[PDB]
Design a protein around this ligand. Sequence first.
Ligand SMILES: [Mg+2]
Ligand SMILES: [Mg+2]
Ligand SMILES: [Mn+2]
Ligand SMILES: [Mn+2]
Lengths: 176, 180
Amino acid sequence: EHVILLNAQGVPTGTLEKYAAHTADTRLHLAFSSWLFNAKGQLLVTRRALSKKAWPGVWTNSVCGHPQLGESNEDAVIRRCRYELGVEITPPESIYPDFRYRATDPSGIVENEVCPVFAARTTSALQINDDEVMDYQWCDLADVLHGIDATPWAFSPWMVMQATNREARKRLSAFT
Amino acid sequence: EHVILLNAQGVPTGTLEKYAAHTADTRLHLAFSSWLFNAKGQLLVTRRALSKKAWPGVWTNSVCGHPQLGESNEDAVIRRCRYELGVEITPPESIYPDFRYRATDPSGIVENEVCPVFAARTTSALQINDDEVMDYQWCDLADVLHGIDATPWAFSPWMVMQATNREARKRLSAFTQLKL
Ligand SMILES: [Mg+2]
Ligand SMILES: [Mg+2]
Ligand SMILES: [Mn+2]
Ligand SMILES: [Mn+2]
């Protein structure tokens, strides 16, 4: 697996192996984030495995990943929902297309990404990949937003930035 | 380094080396938990290091640990505040002395403890020990309590159990006063 390097404009200029790409000095690259809801309207929140290179052990939205060369953002979402969560989903819908951020995790590992955000509904049961996810919770979206607003430090910085974008929050609120 | 083993009633019977004591089958033993506030009345929340045997990488209250043989619980608080956080404190106040709990962590490691709870003020700057603590934040107690109520699963279960005890919570609230 690789990540796709982006120039100042969002143009792909090459690739790097995925593990080697994320360092104290991570360069700008393409990613996605997704929020998954079940048929009941509950939000799936996940806790990243302790083996993840970046933000291990952190509570975050449902599934995040790195599209490969030639892959649509939506196909990447579907791919990592299968890979991390063993779950089938409805066609991903855009909720924050221009999100981009840079942040540094407690051990100094950086994420530096153009990261469009999506939402979808699960259409099967989860089957957890414990190399990716160490814990998870189905919850009411209102409660998760209350937690992000009171104690944002308890959640990943990109989950917070997404959830505190006024429009993204309105659009997420429609899946419940 | 060890733990003090306790029998079915709260009475000590001996010691056990600490790493070895915490397994899937942990026997009841003595511990403490502490909530630390700075002069402004902010609460220190901390994130356990990824190397901790139990609840690694988990957000929790300020400092927790295990008194050693010959140590008062209050001296254990002082010592672990120095070791984990590098910080000096005012005399720890007992705010939940009969707290006792048993819990399994995400890996299956069990904590089984008689765990009196304290609160204190810090009187020096921090010198965080990264072998024990991987992140921290100074917070308004009101906000922490709101987060615990909205998403309790995102924090250590012992922090949540202590915070929702009415009596202990009133003492926490008393420490949010600004003190010069
Ligand atoms: Mg991922
Ligand atoms: Mg400790
Ligand atoms: Mn990345
Ligand atoms: Mn213990």
